Design a binder for this molecule. Structure first.
Ligand SMILES: CCn1nc(C)cc1C(=O)Nc1nc2cc(C(N)=O)cc(OC)c2n1C/C=C/Cn1c(NC(=O)c2cc(C)nn2CC)nc2cc(C(N)=O)cc(OCCCN3CCOCC3)c21
Ligand SMILES: CCn1nc(C)cc1C(=O)Nc1nc2cc(C(N)=O)cc(OC)c2n1C/C=C/Cn1c(NC(=O)c2cc(C)nn2CC)nc2cc(C(N)=O)cc(OCCCN3CCOCC3)c21
Ligand SMILES: CC1(C)C(=O)N(Cc2c(F)cccc2Cl)c2cc(C(=O)NCc3c(F)cc(F)cc3F)ccc21
Ligand SMILES: CC1(C)C(=O)N(Cc2c(F)cccc2Cl)c2cc(C(=O)NCc3c(F)cc(F)cc3F)ccc21
Lengths: 306, 311, 311, 306
């Protein structure tokens, strides 16, 4: 929609693949033709083992979180335990059932010792790490992105404050001038590579500054969208300042912001700004987003958007 | 050290607890004394089982990313596989170890070759389809804070870069211009920014507390940073440029809108993280070298008193 | 990719070769089919031995850094231990595993515990005293390039920060003025920098090749430049602001002096690395927005040909 | 001597610790009293195992470095092999002895396959890494530093060119002016924290700019070393701009320059600049370096150096 390289939200491919895997595995159990009582016993004991492993991982994480009880969790131990071990009730029931089915269904403590050894090794040596796909899925699902805050703050602080006045200001421009008539929209440029030139003339020569939109004060550059050197469109173009912030953050070392992160957060910023402006009451189709990526001329893109 | 309720970065408590647990488990193993080499074989086949579980979880998780290969991973399959299965070479070596060892090693207690594969696939497919292998919010927050995956990070860096980087270098000169032309007191050259942790941002700071009242405007895209003065028992005990950190107001507005997917708990956590990130940014900033102080407060007290004691 | 001889960043061929070797060795083990009992037992004992050898090497190397704690390591003992023995918790856990899994595991062909400790300490003490555990130059170069421990890195970054970042913002306007004044003269707005890999930097650029001749000193803590026309069979086909890169001259001066501890091979490697580092810095910088280009060469050919083909 | 936090060059403490370890281990071998023939066979095969491990590691690295044969090693196979496997002749003789002792003194090839597996796992997962202390020792022994290049270039390009004429220009200023006589030494300050203000007066009110030194051209400024508001010294003050460069490098993200690296390279730059100027023919007590760390009264320190 906005751009071919804007990442769409993640689907349920993992669930479908898990379904196919489950079907194949049940088919192959039917192939083995082994007694199912032992199958059920080992499966119950295996989920009990994994519940105890997640319990041990949660206790290890809770060891660290217990020092942050009064900062992130307002000094309540139950919120900390819920944070470190999922839902307390479901995990508590599953773990008590695990203990009972572990003591009942068969040594006894050696299996526990080896499982605890394996999980402590997982934590210490980092075996139980998270792949980049899992991290990205968790971050996007929970809206844990720089881009989300950037776009929401941008819309709330800037676009929400001039768009209600921009149509009236442009009507004032068209009544006080004859020339021609510029669209009521506030066209916004979204370069994916985050590199915004300080002026459109540097960005493109086929785009020429024409006039400053009439008036607090909010400067706006109507641009001569010249096609073959002739005036072919007039629209207000205003820089997307947050996309410059992403470049500045990737420049600074203190930001801890890589260039892969820079590109990804630029893409998510474009996507979430589009989503915000699609349903914003302030936006009444008087705000358009021009998103482009270097492989090309910006001028041709703006003409296509005119 | 802005406010006592601002969370300090993560420690290594998980690793310390894991070390203690591993020591205790080794003590228990030494005490019991099971077959040590079958213990080792079960441990190698068990790490093979965990690596195979990670392999199957990734393979199932690879299905959702393989369709995002062109956009999120610039159309290279190896990037996608590295994203879904960790480092390809290390994981491949561990999985080759797993395959060879489980095909060759016996399994006295436990499943044979194909039976372990079938039951582990059952367990992992249940983990994914039923969502059993999820992440507790502690690990989610740890990962987000380590990878800087927060809205507060962007809010703080954008606020600094777009406002303080552009007014503070000028603010010293501009207030010197203000103080050269006027005589009484003097406005301190540092821009004072308030950090209400509750994200409560009234439109007028004068109406925030009677002890703060508007004094004048700062003479020079123009940056009209309104100066303010503080009242102590009816007498001006100090004056400085007092303004609000507008990113906190934007965070409150984000939590208000239902399309933001932004809970009130997210609002509070990101407000605290924004305050901490702004402090860290201005600590090592080249332009803001002792040119800005941030007043952070959390209303359960007056705003004027804290700024007065910061004076 | 400025020059064919400029070293590209190191790949992952080491882990590729290790994976291929591991697969071949596992296939060979499957063919031979030794008992897995002593196989896995000895493998864990051997990795325990290697962890204990790294422990002994770290203790010996800490014996020299324990006296550098106040200055180099800001007087913190945990920093010194982490610097001498890797990550403290991971290595501590691995060593506890080693101690427990060697003390308890039997050893048919191998040492008992006390004779293990005796002979392993003997072996590592020999390794350190005789320098037997030495680092081949490939590992030295990989470590230095990975962590940016080079004079080339500092030279390139200082060059960019102190010279290119300070004249390029004004060189555009200055060359605009020079072009507008003279309608005859036509100078590209990009600074041109010469990178001779042999570090041969004479005082006069005209001595480099007869085609290059000093046309006019381009108009202006004041900066200056020079434009050199290029003679193609006696005719000028282009001109540009051509200046040497001083850091290569400083590199040659370093290799000349006996106090720098800088050999000719080091000079060549650092010159190439400086060329690559400056290329990357200028490519990713905002100031070098097509405002500068680098001419990298080594005399085995005329410089005029290269400057022309860039023009 | 330059500053209390400038690390002295590395010693031979590792050698002494290895000697103590060797003595104690030989003592305890003598105490245990084990057959010496099989002890020697095991130790020869053990050093042969370590040599074979280094051989396999060098084989893997050579597989890594063979693609850089035409860039780092001038297209010669022998230089690459010496780079990856140590000295070809010495390691070759040691490994030939290892091969003979393996074939003669031994499941014969099983030991070789297990050692190959262990080495492959060592390289793949990265078990045998290099500690920071070893990396620093290797780098500082071979002059693999940012600070080394920074200081040598700064000296060669600025001090070597202005110090010979500095005393003459100061003498000219002395005849031209009258009552204070500024010292003929160039005083360069070394802030270990790399925080350099734009002006000395801004850095400290106890120092005031006085005038410019008489004079491409080189413009240096004389600064008034005020004390209690009165002149107590007059000498040229000029920041060591390589420290400003180090701060900028730590600021930018593409530099790969951590703040710990920033401090380490600042310390090494000060130390190696001291070493360069101590034995420089162009330096004849006409340059005294002032090094300080903010825990600062720079003016008091400069007065102490007067
Ligand atoms: C990137 C900065 N930032 N990041 C976060 C997070 C918060 C802020 C921030 O707060 N910045 C800020 N605070 C100011 C205070 C004063 C003052 N007089 O005190 C003056 C300023 O500059 C004029 C101020 N600025 C900068 C200019 C800001 C708003 N603005 C923008 N949008 C953004 O900058 C932007 C980027 C992101 C991301 N999110 N936003 C929305 C805030 N485009 C503009 C174009 C014009 C023009 N062409 O004329 C004029 C603008 O300013 C009008 C604002 C007037 N004020 C004072 C009077 O009442 C109403 C508010 C424009
Ligand atoms: C940090 C920049 N850098 N990194 C590397 C690596 C090489 C250079 C570099 O030299 N860049 C450069 N090229 C220039 C050309 C002109 C011109 N008019 O053409 C003018 C410039 O600056 C005004 C020029 N500069 C700036 C810096 C210049 C030399 N210089 C320094 N030393 C350093 O900064 C420094 C730090 C480190 C580390 N290493 N070095 C030197 C190798 N101190 C100075 C104080 C004064 C003063 N108070 O008057 C005047 C100086 O230069 C005027 C005359 C210089 N001659 C030199 C020969 O060529 C013609 C100009 C000074
Ligand atoms: C650490 C230790 C000793 C351990 O506690 N368990 C789990 C466990 C119990 F808690 C309790 C009883 C039995 C088991 Cl088996 C385990 C498993 C293996 C293994 O080989 N495979 C995993 C695996 C499968 F694929 C299928 C399956 F039905 C079961 C299963 F366990 C190796 C070592 C262990
Ligand atoms: C991988 C494998 C099979 C192997 O190749 N070696 C080295 C080796 C030979 F190649 C060949 C013969 C003997 C040995 Cl010993 C080894 C050692 C152990 C061990 O138990 N201890 C280490 C250890 C010490 F503490 C002291 C010491 F003097 C020697 C020593 F090896 C376990 C497994 C192996």
């Amino acid at each position: 929609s906005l751009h071919p390289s804007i990442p769409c939200p993640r689907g349920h491919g993992a669930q479908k693949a898990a379904l196919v895997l489950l079907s194949a595995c049940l088919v192959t159990l039917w192939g083995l033709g082994e007694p199912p009582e032992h199958t059920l016993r080992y499966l119950v004991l295996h989920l009990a083992s994994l519940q105890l492993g997640l319990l041990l991982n949660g206790v290890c994480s809770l060891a660290e979180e217990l020092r942050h009880i009064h900062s992130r969790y307002r000094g309540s131990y139950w919120r900390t335990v819920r944070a470190c071990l999922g839902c307390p009730l479901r995990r508590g029931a599953l773990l008590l059932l695990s203990i009972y089915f572990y003591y009942s269904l068969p040594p006894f403590t050696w299996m526990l010792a080896l499982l605890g050894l394996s999980q402590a090794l997982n934590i210490l040596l980092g075996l139980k790490g998270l792949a980049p796909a899992e991290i990205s899925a968790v971050c996007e699902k929970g809206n844990f992105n720089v881009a989300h805050g950037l776009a929401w703050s941008y819309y709330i602080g800037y676009l929400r404050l001039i768009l209600p006045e921009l149509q009236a200001r442009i009507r004032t421009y068209n009544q006080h001038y004859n020339n021609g008539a510029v669209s009521q929209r506030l066209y916004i440029l979204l370069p994916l590579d985050c590199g915004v030139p300080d002026n459109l003339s540097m960005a493109d020569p086929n785009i020429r500054f024409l006039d400053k939109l009439p008036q607090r004060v909010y400067s706006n550059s109507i641009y001569e969208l010249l096609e073959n050197g002739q005036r072919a469109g007039t629209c207000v173009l205003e820089y997307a300042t947050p996309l410059q912030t992403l470049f500045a953050m990737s420049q600074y070392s203190q930001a801890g912001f890589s260039r892969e992160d820079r590109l990804e957060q630029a893409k998510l910023f474009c996507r979430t700004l589009e989503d915000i402006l699609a349903d914003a009451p302030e936006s009444q189709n008087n705000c358009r987003l021009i998103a482009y990526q270097e492989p090309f001329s910006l001028s041709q893109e703006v003409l296509r958007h005119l």
